[PDB]
Amino acid sequence: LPSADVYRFAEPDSEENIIFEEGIPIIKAGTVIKLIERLTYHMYADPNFVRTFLTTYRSFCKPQELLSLIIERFEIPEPKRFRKEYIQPVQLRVLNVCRHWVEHHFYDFERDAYLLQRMEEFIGTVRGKAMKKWVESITKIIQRKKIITFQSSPPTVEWHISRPGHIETFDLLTLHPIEIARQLTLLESDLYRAVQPSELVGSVWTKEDKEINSPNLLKMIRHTTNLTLWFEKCIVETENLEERVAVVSRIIEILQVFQELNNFNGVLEVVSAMNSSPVYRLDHTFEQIPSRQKKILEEAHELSEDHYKKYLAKLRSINPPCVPFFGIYLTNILKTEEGNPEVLKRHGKELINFSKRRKVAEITGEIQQYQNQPYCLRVESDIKRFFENLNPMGNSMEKEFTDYLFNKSLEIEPRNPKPLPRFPKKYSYPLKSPGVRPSN
């Protein structure tokens, strides 16, 4: 026997309130006042419903109004022993929800100082010395946030033509291919691990304030784009056909090392550089490519076909660490959010569709899964700093630079009827690849 509902959201579960998905019930839609009711249910505690709600709630509720209605949930009026038994765990759930909130989603409070003020006021209001001794934990979490050994030692850093410290002489054919793939895998794994779910939920990276709300995601995407462009620029600006096949071969070797290190982001970097307009038509250059590397590149390219069928397969099969490809996740998230209704309607009443939010949360979780295990590879500071300050475009813009690349391709390999002119050599050092199998 709870209150009269004129002092609570105690209205019993109805079809105008909640609908579940055909041993805890999976909520599929419901009025917000009952959504939080199930979030702080007395019958049972649902930790995954908490983890999913607090990650995907801003799309139908602002942090302030959530704090307000959870405070409204914590303040229960009495109509006895039965009812105190009921009141205890509801308040417990509310306080553990606040704990999870400040723990895993503290940004909501860094962007709203008054939200933190309300939270601190609210936790300073709980009474019952036992409960308050338990509340000190949330207090300490707030105060905190306001202020790996592998089996064998990682393999040696490999060098080729550039001796360590000679950063001036760093380039694609100067550094060892294996180490190029390694340092790129490290940088891209760090970029992939830095992306937090607050930058994907709500499709916020596609809206006008994407620079503000998705800085790490855009940083990683720009890195991969920049490297694809650098690959094309190395191929096409190498006007001598001999050196140009050298460049293409080293790039295919780096693709091999990517395939091995399970760095699929870098694999796609390379195969995009190959599928570009300026590079895809260099018939006279791919002619001289060994067949064993042609099959490597073909196996890589087949990963994206039929909507990345083989990529999804291989990613689900391999053992991490790995740098998966992000674009697929982003496409799926955007299409779920903009392809499913924001609310369901029943008996003329609007209920927040939560299933959609749960699916987006699943995609977020699969992103976070691969962010755990790091790479057992030693970083070289200066090679990393070489690939961090690479600017193929320079001061040019997208169209200007794309056209420069395509026109350079036309220059080094004119269309059929015209004969292939030969160019002088660019690189005054040997072009033999030092293999792609390590030293020892």
């Binding site: 499709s203 990276w205 596609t206 809206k207 006008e208 855009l218 995407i221 720009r222 991969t224 784009t225 694809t228 462009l229 094309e232 796609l268 195969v271 995009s272 550089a273 599928n275 570009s276 307009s277 895809y280 038509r281 994206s304 909507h307 674009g327 982003l330 496409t331 799926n332 998230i333 955007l334 299409k335 779920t336 903009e338 392809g339 499913n340 209704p341 699916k359 997208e398 169209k399 395509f406």
Partner: protein
């Protein structure tokens, strides 16, 4: 039967993903899951002939610009989409078409120009200027609505017909 590889190109942020979804979203259904093959393949009969449309919409990946070529080299027909309420999405169409032409190595690629309209905004691109641009490119123009399904079927069918008549 014949299978047609369509590609949807257009500036993001204006909800071009409504085009594909509304089509293969067998209607009166509003649930969508972009993880099934059914979520981008659909068999339809056009002008009595049966065919299977496979639609590639890289929505959300607009920032992977260096990949566009790869993606665009997938298709034999293209839908160049712009938002009727967003002028800059209409101005980007020219370089989108230049890029499509460049990757397919052809001055006559099967493509249609389609302008989607979400109601909550006000139109800033009049139908006449889009009709004129389409005429200058030698391609058809169809307007679609992201809330009423109006024009979606026509949009995709006419691209299939541009492929056949090519």
């Amino acid at each position: 039967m014949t299978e047609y590889k369509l590609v949807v190109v257009g500036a993001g942020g204006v909800g071009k993903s409504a085009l594909t979804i509304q089509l293969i979203q067998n209607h009166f259904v509003d649930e969508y899951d972009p993880t099934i093959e059914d979520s981008y393949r659909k068999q339809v009969v056009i002008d009595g002939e049966t065919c299977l449309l496979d639609i590639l919409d890289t929505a959300g990946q607009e920032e992977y610009s260096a990949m566009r070529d790869q993606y665009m080299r997938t298709g034999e027909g293209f839908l160049c989409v712009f938002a009727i309420n967003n002028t800059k999405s209409f101005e980007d169409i020219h370089q989108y078409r230049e890029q499509i032409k460049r990757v397919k190595d052809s001055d006559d690629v099967p493509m249609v120009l389609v302008g989607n309209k979400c109601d909550l905004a006000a139109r800033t691109v009049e139908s006449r200027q889009a009709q004129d641009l389409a005429r200058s490119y030698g391609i058809p123009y169809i307007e679609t609505s992201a809330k009423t399904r109006q024009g979606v079927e026509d949009a995709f069918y006419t691209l299939v017909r541009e492929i056949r008549q090519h």
